[PDB]
Amino acid sequence: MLQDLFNNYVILVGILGLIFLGVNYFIVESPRMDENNGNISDYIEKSGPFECGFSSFEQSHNPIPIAFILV
Amino acid sequence: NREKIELKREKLWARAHLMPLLQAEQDRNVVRRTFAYYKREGEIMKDVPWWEVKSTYSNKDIFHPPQTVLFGKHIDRDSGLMYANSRNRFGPD
Amino acid sequence: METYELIDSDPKFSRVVRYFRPSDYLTWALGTIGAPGLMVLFEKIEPAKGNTFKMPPPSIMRIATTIGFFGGFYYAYTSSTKRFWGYSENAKEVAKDRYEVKKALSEKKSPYGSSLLNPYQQDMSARNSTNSQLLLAIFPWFNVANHQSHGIDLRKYYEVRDGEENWNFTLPPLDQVKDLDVAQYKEYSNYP
Amino acid sequence: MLNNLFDFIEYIEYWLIIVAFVASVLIVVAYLTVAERKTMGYMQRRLGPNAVGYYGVLMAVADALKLLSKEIVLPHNGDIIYVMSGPLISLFSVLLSWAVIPFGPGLSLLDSEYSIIYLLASGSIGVFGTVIVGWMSNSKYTVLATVRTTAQLISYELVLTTVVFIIALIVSSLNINVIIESQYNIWYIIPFFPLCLIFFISALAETARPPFDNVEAESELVSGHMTELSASPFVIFFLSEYCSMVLMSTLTAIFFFGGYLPFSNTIHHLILNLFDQHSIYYFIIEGILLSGYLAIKANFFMFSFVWIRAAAPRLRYDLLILFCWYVLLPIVFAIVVFAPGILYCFDALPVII
Amino acid sequence: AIGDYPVYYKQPIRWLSYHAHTRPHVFYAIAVAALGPVFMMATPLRRKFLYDDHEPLPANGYPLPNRSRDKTLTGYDD
Amino acid sequence: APLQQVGRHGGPNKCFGEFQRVVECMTNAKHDSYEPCNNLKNDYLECRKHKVERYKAFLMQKHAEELGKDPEEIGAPFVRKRRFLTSKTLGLVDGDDYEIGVEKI
Amino acid sequence: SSTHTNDSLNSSNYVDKLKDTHFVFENDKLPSEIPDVEEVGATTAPLLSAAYFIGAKCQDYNDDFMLCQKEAKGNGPIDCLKEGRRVTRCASGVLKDLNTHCSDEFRLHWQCLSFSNLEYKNCRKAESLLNKCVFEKMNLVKKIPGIPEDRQIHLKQNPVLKPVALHQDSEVAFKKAQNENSI
Amino acid sequence: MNLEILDLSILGFYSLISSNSFESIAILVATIMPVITELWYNYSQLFALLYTLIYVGAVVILFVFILSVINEKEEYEYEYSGLFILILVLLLDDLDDNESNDNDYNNVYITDYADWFNNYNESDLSVIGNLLFTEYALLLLIISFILLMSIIGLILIVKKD
Amino acid sequence: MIPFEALIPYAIMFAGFCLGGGVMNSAITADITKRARGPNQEIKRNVGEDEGPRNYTKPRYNTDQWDKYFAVRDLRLTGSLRGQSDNAVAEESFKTNSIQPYSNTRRPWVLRRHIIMKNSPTKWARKYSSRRDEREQEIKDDYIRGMGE
Numbered sequence A: 001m002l003q004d005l006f007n008n009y010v011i012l013v014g015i016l017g018l019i020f021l022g023v024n025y026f027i028v029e030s031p032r033m034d035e036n037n038g039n040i041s042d043y044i045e046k047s048g049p050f051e052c053g054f055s056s057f058e059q060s061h062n063p064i065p066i067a068f069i070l071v
Numbered sequence B: 001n002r003e004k005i006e007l008k009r010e011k012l013w014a015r016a017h018l019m020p021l022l023q024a025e026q027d028r029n030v031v032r033r034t035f036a037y038y039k040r041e042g043e044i045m046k047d048v049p050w051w052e053v054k055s056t057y058s059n060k061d062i063f064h065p066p067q068t069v070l071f072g073k074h075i076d077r078d079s080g081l082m083y084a085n086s087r088n089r090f091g092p093d
Numbered sequence C: 001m002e003t004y005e006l007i008d009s010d011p012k013f014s015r016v017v018r019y020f021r022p023s024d025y026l027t028w029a030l031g032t033i034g035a036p037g038l039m040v041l042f043e044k045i046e047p048a049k050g051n052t053f054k055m056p057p058p059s060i061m062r063i064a065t066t067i068g069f070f071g072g073f074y075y076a077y078t079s080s081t082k083r084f085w086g087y088s089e090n091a092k093e094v095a096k097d098r099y100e101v102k103k104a105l106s107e108k109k110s111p112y113g114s115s116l117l118n119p120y121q122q123d124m125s126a127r128n129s130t131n132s133q134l135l136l137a138i139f140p141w142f143n144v145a146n147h148q149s150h151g152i153d154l155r156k157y158y159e160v161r162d163g164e165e166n167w168n169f170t171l172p173p174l175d176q177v178k179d180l181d182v183a184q185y186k187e188y189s190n191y192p
Numbered sequence D: 001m002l003n004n005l006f007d008f009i010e011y012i013e014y015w016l017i018i019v020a021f022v023a024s025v026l027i028v029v030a031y032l033t034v035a036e037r038k039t040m041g042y043m044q045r046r047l048g049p050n051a052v053g054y055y056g057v058l059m060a061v062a063d064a065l066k067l068l069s070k071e072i073v074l075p076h077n078g079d080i081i082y083v084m085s086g087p088l089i090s091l092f093s094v095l096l097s098w099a100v101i102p103f104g105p106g107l108s109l110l111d112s113e114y115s116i117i118y119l120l121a122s123g124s125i126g127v128f129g130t131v132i133v134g135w136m137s138n139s140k141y142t143v144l145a146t147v148r149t150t151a152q153l154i155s156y157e158l159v160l161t162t163v164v165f166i167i168a169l170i171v172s173s174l175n176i177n178v179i180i181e182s183q184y185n186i187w188y189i190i191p192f193f194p195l196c197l198i199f200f201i202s203a204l205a206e207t208a209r210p211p212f213d214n215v216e217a218e219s220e221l222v223s224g225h226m227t228e229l230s231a232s233p234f235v236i237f238f239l240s241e242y243c244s245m246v247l248m249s250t251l252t253a254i255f256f257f258g259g260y261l262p263f264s265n266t267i268h269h270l271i272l273n274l275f276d277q278h279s280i281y282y283f284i285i286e287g288i289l290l291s292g293y294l295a296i297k298a299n300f301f302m303f304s305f306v307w308i309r310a311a312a313p314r315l316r317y318d319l320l321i322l323f324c325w326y327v328l329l330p331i332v333f334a335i336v337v338f339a340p341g342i343l344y345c346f347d348a349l350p351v352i353i
Numbered sequence E: 001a002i003g004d005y006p007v008y009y010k011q012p013i014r015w016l017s018y019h020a021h022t023r024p025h026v027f028y029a030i031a032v033a034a035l036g037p038v039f040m041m042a043t044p045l046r047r048k049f050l051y052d053d054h055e056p057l058p059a060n061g062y063p064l065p066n067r068s069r070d071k072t073l074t075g076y077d078d
Numbered sequence F: 001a002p003l004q005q006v007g008r009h010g011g012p013n014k015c016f017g018e019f020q021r022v023v024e025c026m027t028n029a030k031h032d033s034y035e036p037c038n039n040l041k042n043d044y045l046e047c048r049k050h051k052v053e054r055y056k057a058f059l060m061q062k063h064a065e066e067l068g069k070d071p072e073e074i075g076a077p078f079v080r081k082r083r084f085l086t087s088k089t090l091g092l093v094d095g096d097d098y099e100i101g102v103e104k105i
Numbered sequence G: 001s002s003t004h005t006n007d008s009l010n011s012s013n014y015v016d017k018l019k020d021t022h023f024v025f026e027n028d029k030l031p032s033e034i035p036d037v038e039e040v041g042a043t044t045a046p047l048l049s050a051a052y053f054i055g056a057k058c059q060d061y062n063d064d065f066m067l068c069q070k071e072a073k074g075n076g077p078i079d080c081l082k083e084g085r086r087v088t089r090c091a092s093g094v095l096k097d098l099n100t101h102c103s104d105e106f107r108l109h110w111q112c113l114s115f116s117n118l119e120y121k122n123c124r125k126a127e128s129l130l131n132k133c134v135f136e137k138m139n140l141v142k143k144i145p146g147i148p149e150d151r152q153i154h155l156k157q158n159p160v161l162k163p164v165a166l167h168q169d170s171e172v173a174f175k176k177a178q179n180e181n182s183i
Numbered sequence H: 001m002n003l004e005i006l007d008l009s010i011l012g013f014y015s016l017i018s019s020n021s022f023e024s025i026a027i028l029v030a031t032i033m034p035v036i037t038e039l040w041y042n043y044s045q046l047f048a049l050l051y052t053l054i055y056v057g058a059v060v061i062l063f064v065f066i067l068s069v070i071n072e073k074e075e076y077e078y079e080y081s082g083l084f085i086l087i088l089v090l091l092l093d094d095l096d097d098n099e100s101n102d103n104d105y106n107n108v109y110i111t112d113y114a115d116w117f118n119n120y121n122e123s124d125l126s127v128i129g130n131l132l133f134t135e136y137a138l139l140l141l142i143i144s145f146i147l148l149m150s151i152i153g154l155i156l157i158v159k160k161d
Numbered sequence I: 001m002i003p004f005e006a007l008i009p010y011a012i013m014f015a016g017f018c019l020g021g022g023v024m025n026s027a028i029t030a031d032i033t034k035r036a037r038g039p040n041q042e043i044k045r046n047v048g049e050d051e052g053p054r055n056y057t058k059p060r061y062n063t064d065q066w067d068k069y070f071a072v073r074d075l076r077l078t079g080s081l082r083g084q085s086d087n088a089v090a091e092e093s094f095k096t097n098s099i100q101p102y103s104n105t106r107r108p109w110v111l112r113r114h115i116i117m118k119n120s121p122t123k124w125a126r127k128y129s130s131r132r133d134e135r136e137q138e139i140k141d142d143y144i145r146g147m148g149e
């Protein structure tokens, strides 16, 4: 049994995943070519969490009861 | 599943008939490499008068082939791709 | 130590039950009714609720009878096993064992019986089940296979003892008895 | 050149074989997204995408290219680890599961006696990659969806694993190719029709497809774990989810419909008798034929994924847990005892050959 | 007493019906699972009425003839 | 007596025979003490780790260094890459240095 | 079985890298005191095709070589060299007779095995022709021990499991004998 | 270059600087993956796959418990460490990776000799099952007993009723 | 009324599978047959005139250890892991071209480098305590001392 062909496939899968990130990164127009609202870091109104329009309590680190924990 | 049993029986007996000729060839290979081990040991430790070339097992009536070797030439040391600039296996380049 | 004659170092499950004495059945009944009876005694010794006697509910007596029924059989199984092992007096069981083996030998049948198991599994089964009755109080394990590892030599069945002349069993040599190890590996030494 | 050019192709030949293997799977996944909308459209008495490319053949290309041209939303450029690690784990898991799928006899990248275990083990990693999106996230819809993913995983994982083990038990092998070739005289749909339903029900729950789409329930959790995902992280998760639909459809065809075996042995011989076996063209046609049989069976179950979405409403996940633990598990563990008993009674315990 | 809960040891048949009507996921899973050992108990019938068990596979290595080495064998000598 | 040292195909492995001869020696009733079975114990342990045999190879390599012997002139030829187990290295009549196929058997 | 071992080639070159595997040769021949013998030169498919004829011709020598191994009591590979050389010559004799008497029938069968994953069930038609040719010219009959002669799988009229793909050469060669021999 | 050494170097760095409980449940997965791959490529592919099949199901259950117990404590807390003390610690650790001191056992390479006697050739899992279900069947039945106790144990701990 | 427009994506999906199978079945089978022709490139690529029709070898599956020994044995005869030869006698070079893999037997890297997994009472003893290796060095020393007798 020889798995050298399988090794090459696994290598390709790992590289192929990084291609989607890279290609999207090199293809998007720079923000200055767009409305030019600056880098995404400053635009906190965009990077904030989605709550259907209205902000709410930031409960990210509060514990969540789980009703199926026994199962 | 009842034919698979018969198909397995045919395969098992086919391998049984080839087993002696395949093992006889394998037995000669092990014996050939066994003498090559003790010949290499005899050459390296010849000038040591007290050294005895023998196996490491006390039971002398059981054949224990050696399982270690001393490494020599690296044949594919200068290899590229699709071609190994293979060094001479039999003697100096 | 008051040792006796070894009959079977690993008696089969059916042989142990068949060789039950009438007392072994008596103790089986005592175990079965001893568990509901102890529930009455414990209530009599000290009532579960309050200070007055109250009969335990029928559902408790149902599960108690089942627990006693299994306990009564395990006790009877170990009582009969000791006779096969020679730890307990087994004069009656030796005479019955000798008749059954000599009868089967004369028919050229295995005293142990034919098995679905191959030679490895017969050996493996005997390894798992032999002496397992010493832990029958903890968890169950029984010999329900026809293996040949019984700790006995079948040549001792070829000498007639006192009270066995009227049986008139003509015993063939062991190499003609079907399904025995000494009459199985005829062509190949690794196949029966 | 000449000689160097010719044997360089030999040096690169197997990489092209993998590239062709990757290309073939991505074409089915890309056009499954188109086929689902076309199938749902006509069942809903609409058309579905027919304006993007000739008769809608470029709709999948447009969706990918548009999403690949979108800004990625994240607090900082260095925060790629947060919302990209999850999509990659999910995508790498399903893609690696395709290494054991044989398009023909011996035509799998990985062949081993434990291909069944590799298949189940690889897909379990994808479940982990999904929950990573709700990594102490401040998005309550992503957090609510992560809880439901775990609840669904507990539901289907036992049933899906045990069903595949019964099929492996009937052939006494964990090699996927041996299971396919064991179905020459009978397709396991006939002896194990109950298990085919259970496998498909488990596949719907594994892929978070309706009626078990409780993870990405739009009417409940806007987009589930994808509510904060845009551009490339959204494509990768979407691509992996539809890759899993193709994988589970192909596994339904392998475990119960004979894999690549022909529908008609007579017709299969008739078609192949036209081509000389001493020519390479015979093996092209045979490769097309055998994969076509696998394609036809897998197309029907990819159709069935779309079909059940357009006919059945969604079931709450707490009901899914009771359904899998009180109904499916007792039935499957009954068959895992039923099947060896039948085979032993008729002296037909399976062996590998 | 139109729809009471049957007592198993008094009305075994009605007790079976209650669970087959109200808990099908329990009644029929057990019924399928019972068919396993029942078929294993019907195996002795098959060995007497349909066909016998197959001969065991030679899975114990090379079959060595149960005899002494032939000391008169010649041929293909050095 | 439970089975020990079972090979990957169900039968005895390489070192079972050494272990079996140790058990037979230790449990034989003809032995006053366990001294006769001491060499059998070392043989079994040598079958698994080969520690004394590896130690002998350590001495031979070291003794060859101090006398100036070339490692590549007294050792055994070897190949590290499986793709270059070529027909020229194997010694075939029409041998070649082109790589062998190991991608799919 | 694809288990990684230290006695043969493993699955991939990542296994060699982790183990730092060295593929070692030995240029020394067998010692001159041991008599020489020409090895068997057939590969996997011809050997499997010829397996039951080597068994029917070298049964005495195969058993004697194996019985030597049992009586060797651990000193196996040394004490059965002479018996092994008989086995090699007898097996080469069968392969020699195949290439002179049943060459086309023999090469047909193991070319089907190469075409069909080396599964005996996929190449019954070529095997039947080879069995008929060998029996007429070498008086060798394939027998599967332990079972009745009429329950041998290779003689089954209507097998349950049949090849999906047909070897075209075997189909042609089977038709030719049907119309010319069994009139 | 053995790239598994680099993987464990990164993992050891992230175990020293890990702060919250989510990072710990990631150190576990970042540990099983090097184990699974190294078992796959060197010693046992069967147990590489068994690890993936069993540990992943345990990991997700472990992850879901983190959601129900996360308690705000370590997001806003501060750690000091120091980059220099971290890297120096990892350098000193990397210096000594010889778990065994038998130099000959670690340096001299060995081989095994194949034989053709095993004509009934099956996978390691078939032999493991053959022994586990026949000779060590008691071990299997005790394991079944322990699994039953866990089922009862989990209920009597968690269930309020 | 069969909607043909809805069936178009299924036709492309069908052709997606056929692309993979058509390439894999033919490309792999051709390469195995090509490399089974001989031990060098001039025989693999060129086709002799006196040769007959090309017989193809299909890819192998469901193998065991015997097939690994067969593959290496075929390589020593033909230079291919699936070479073809029915000669009753091998070449002279087959007697001395055996391949013996020699490998280290060290514990996995994760065992001896993981920050947590490498710590245990017996692992510390094996790594930092010389009590075990002192005893085993006595056994090795007896081997050379006892040579003279």
Ligand SMILES: CCCCCCCCCCCCCCCCCC(=O)OC[C@H](COP(=O)(O)OCCN)OC(=O)CCCCCCCCCCCCCCCCC
Pocket (backbone or CB within 6 Å): D081, D082, D085, D086, D088, D089, D132, D135, H007, H008, H010, H011, H014, H015, H018, H019, H022, H023, H024, H026, H027, H029, H030, H031, H033
């Ligand atoms: C497909 C690839 C997926 C992974 C790509 C992302 C690479 C990041 C590291 C992956 C694993 C390497 C080892 C990390 C172990 C876990 C330690 C950890 O806390 O995660 C590191 C990550 C970085 O956060 P950072 O800002 O650098 O440090 C905190 C500063 N106060 O802090 C985080 O919490 C982010 C973690 C995101 C979720 C990762 C879940 C683990 C996935 C592991 C799969 C691969 C297994 C490991 C292989 C490499 C081994 C070193």
Ligand SMILES: CCCCCCCCCCCC(=O)OC[C@H](COP(=O)(O)OCC[N+](C)(C)C)OC(=O)CCCCCCCCCCC
Pocket (backbone or CB within 6 Å): D193, D194, D195, D197, D198, D200, D201, D211, D304, D308, D312, D315, D319, D323, D327, D331, E028, E032
């Ligand atoms: C022994 C032979 C085994 C048969 C094999 C199949 C087993 C299936 C079991 C179903 C039981 C069931 O539907 O269960 C219903 C449960 C819970 O329902 P409930 O709350 O108990 O109400 C019903 C109880 N009544 C009616 C007695 C009061 O949830 C469901 O609605 C599950 C819906 C599953 C639909 C999935 C779609 C799959 C489409 C497949 C297209 C190819």
